[PDB]
């Protein structure tokens, strides 16, 4: 399945990062600020391959030593992974505590040690705090790797004890060329997907590979039906899913582009769908458009943040409040200081 799919835009950075470890002066803790699915996992995996290799050469693992074989097999006494438990999107303090207690003993293979957390943004406060000191002063030859959507989203204490590497996304033309090579579809839709993925080619490619593109097309059609009539409730049929935050973000981008079109911005995030954005711009006043956009993004943040929240109630209430906002003579929310 999904594995170390190396990406070209990681080449300038990887060769740099291994250098920081080749001289032996590298930081034990490297927090990667990379967009999801952009390639942070593959880069961290390759770095760990270099680190745990007993007889490495240049900028790649030998693939012959027993450390390389064990790493390939997925089992290694000196390669700990911290990933959310199956069916739960969080990293418990118990796993971090077990890993930290295991770090006390020496490395079995006589080499170094690697502790890789799949996503530091999913750390529970207790787990991140249990990892604080382990991050600060690890034992001899211990290496930590962290990945995050946003470093500032992490705990203000954990992020302090870590060298932060930022993976710059490729320029839009390079990304669209890469995805055109990977996917044979229209340029407009490809650019729209890249802008939707905040310029990250990996996320746009994953969006096209999955059914998310069909869902986006269905949501665009539902919006086209609902904008002139105000039948926003039907949007529920397209909005309620296990990937609801992504579709809410798509709606937010559409509202972004409607406000841009009213202001006349040269480029828009949704370039593949001009009819819907034009309909939104002409039908809805900017004053109510801003309120709808703010409420949609607030609902998205609430849905992402608090675990166990019910998607049905939140999405239905968002749609009903949007329909209420559409009616004239209704006060609008104002951002709170």
């Amino acid at each position: 399945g999904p594995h170390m799919r190396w990406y070209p835009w990681l080449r300038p950075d990887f060769e740099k990062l291994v250098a920081s470890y080749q001289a032996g002066r590298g930081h034990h803790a490297l927090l990667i600020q990379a967009l999801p699915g952009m390639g942070d996992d593959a880069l961290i995996y390759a770095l760990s391959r270099y680190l745990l290799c007993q007889q490495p050469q240049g900028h790649k693992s030998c693939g012959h030593c027993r450390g390389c074989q064990l790493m390939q097999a997925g089992t290694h006494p000196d390669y700990y992974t911290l990933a959310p438990e199956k069916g739960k999107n969080t990293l418990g303090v118990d796993a971090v505590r077990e890993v930290t207690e295991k770090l006390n003993e020496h490395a079995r293979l006589g080499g170094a040690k690697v502790v890789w957390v799949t996503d530091a943004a999913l750390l529970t406060d207790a787990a991140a705090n249990a990892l604080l000191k382990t991050l600060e002063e690890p034992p001899a030859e211990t290496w930590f790797f962290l990945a995050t959507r946003e470093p500032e989203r992490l705990l203000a204490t954990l992020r302090s004890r870590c060298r932060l590497h930022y993976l710059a996304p490729p320029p839009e033309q390079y990304a669209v060329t890469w995805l055109s090579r990977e996917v044979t579809m229209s340029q407009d839709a490809l650019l729209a997907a890249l802008r939707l993925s905040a310029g990250s080619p990996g996320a746009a490619l994953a969006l096209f590979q999955g059914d998310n593109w069909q869902a986006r097309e269905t949501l665009c059609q539902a919006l086209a039906y609902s904008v002139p009539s105000g039948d926003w409730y039907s949007l529920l049929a397209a909005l309620n899913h296990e990937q609801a935050p992504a579709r809410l973000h798509w709606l937010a981008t559409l509202l972004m582009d409607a406000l841009k079109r009213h202001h006349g911005a040269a480029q828009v995030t949704n370039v593949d769908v001009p009819g819907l954005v034009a309909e939104l711009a002409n039908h809805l006043s900017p004053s109510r458009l801003q309120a709808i956009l703010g409420d949609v993004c607030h609902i998205r943040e609430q849905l992402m943040s608090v675990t166990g929240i019910n998607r049905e109630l939140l999405i239905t209430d968002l749609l009903l409040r949007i329909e209420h906002y559409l009616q004239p003579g209704v006060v609008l929310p104002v951002p709170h200081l």
């Binding site: 060298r163 932060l164 590497h165 905040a198 972004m256 841009k260 006349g264 911005a265 943040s305």
Partner: protein
């Protein structure tokens, strides 16, 4: 092997003597006077923001307390006890990673062993790090011991968030507020350590590191190590500027002048251009906040302006000449709220777009 893994600056440059400590003069003076006068307490709680040095200060206090020279305000650093506590093998000093041993079973087991004698040193110092992560039962188990501990045991708590401690715990301890280090202190310490290790640098780069560290020596040191790794052994101004995130061009002032004119076209064109250059959005918003602050400051009092950068401040005088103070205040408030909610956005660029659209919506017609 002298712990090769100590090549990281944050692990090698922690102070080993009271004189080596930078800043924190009030707490250092209080500790020195307490040690010299004999006014020794049994529960010290060093509270402050992260990367200020409370763990290092507590370890220095433990070194001073358990030195064979006596209860000295300045540890020798070469005695057997000092060497052992530097090595971390000292039995009489117990470092509790309270963020990991937060259970009450471990706390009760530890407190049942307080009556015994110390092995070598005079005092059985307890360095409880990250106290606020203890369970409530673990806090309540500490009350009787902290009130009246034996004469041979001392607790050195160290939290980065004192308000989460129960008031019954704050009540039994001497609270030392570790003041956040100023820009000058951070810059001087960074210069001293870099010149000690013979690393190429520029004073402007150090100024940028100190300003962007947000009042923390550990943050500044980690950023310095990042700059060293990025710039191939030299702290060059261009590398650290491209790394931390700087606005050398005047696109911030152009963005401000386009937004205050309610020119959505120019605002979005400038955002597109800045994104095409890979701008760091948080630093951009910080620069707009600074520009608006200077605009209001000069609106109140003539002169007293961005004289540092005369070029932009002339146009700034024009802006302060036209824009009413209320509009500037609301623009600043909206930009600040956008910075606050920038993490809570699907994309940083989208967050900045939200902030600027909200700013535009105040006076879209005018």
């Amino acid at each position: 092997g002298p712990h090769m893994s100590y090549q990281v600056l944050a692990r090698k440059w922690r102070p080993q003597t009271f004189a080596d400590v930078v800043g924190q003069e009030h707490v250092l003076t209080a500790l020195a006077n307490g040690l010299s006068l004999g006014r020794i307490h049994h529960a010290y709680l060093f509270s402050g923001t992260r990367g200020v040095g409370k763990t290092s200060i507590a370890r220095l206090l433990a070194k001073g307390l358990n030195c064979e020279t006596g209860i000295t305000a300045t540890p020798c650093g070469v005695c057997d006890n000092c060497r052992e506590i530097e090595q971390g093998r000292f039995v009489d000093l117990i470092e509790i990673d309270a963020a990991s041993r937060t259970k009450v079973e471990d706390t009760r087991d530890l407190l049942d062993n307080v009556q015994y004698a110390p092995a070598r040193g005079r005092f059985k110092v307890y360095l409880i790090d990250e106290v606020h992560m203890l369970s409530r039962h673990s806090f309540n188990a500490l009350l009787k011991t902290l009130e009246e501990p034996p004469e041979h045991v001392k607790f050195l708590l160290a939290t980065t968030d004192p308000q989460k401690l129960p008031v019954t715990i704050l009540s039994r301890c001497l609270q030392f507020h570790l003041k956040a280090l100023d820009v000058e202190q951070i810059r001087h310490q960074l210069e001293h350590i870099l010149n000690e290790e013979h690393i190429a640098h520029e004073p402007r780069a150090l100024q940028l590191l100190a300003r962007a560290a947000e009042g923390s020596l550990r943050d500044a040191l980690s950023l310095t190590d990042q700059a060293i790794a990025s710039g191939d052994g030299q702290v060059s101004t261009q590398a650290v500027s491209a790394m931390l995130g700087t606005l050398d061009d005047d696109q911030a002032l152009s963005l401000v002048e386009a937004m205050v004119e309610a020119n959505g076209e120019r605002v979005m064109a400038l955002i597109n251009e800045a994104a095409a250059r890979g701008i760091e959005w948080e630093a951009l918003l910080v620069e707009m906040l600074g520009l608006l602050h200077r605009i209001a400051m000069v609106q109140l009092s003539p002169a007293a302006l961005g004289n540092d950068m005369a070029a932009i401040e002339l146009r700034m005088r024009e802006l302060a000449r036209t824009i009413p103070p209320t509009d500037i205040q609301l623009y600043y408030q909206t930009l600040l709220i956008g910075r606050k909610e920038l993490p809570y956005a699907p994309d940083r660029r989208m967050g900045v777009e939200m902030t600027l659209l909200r700013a535009l919506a105040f006076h879209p017609r005018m």
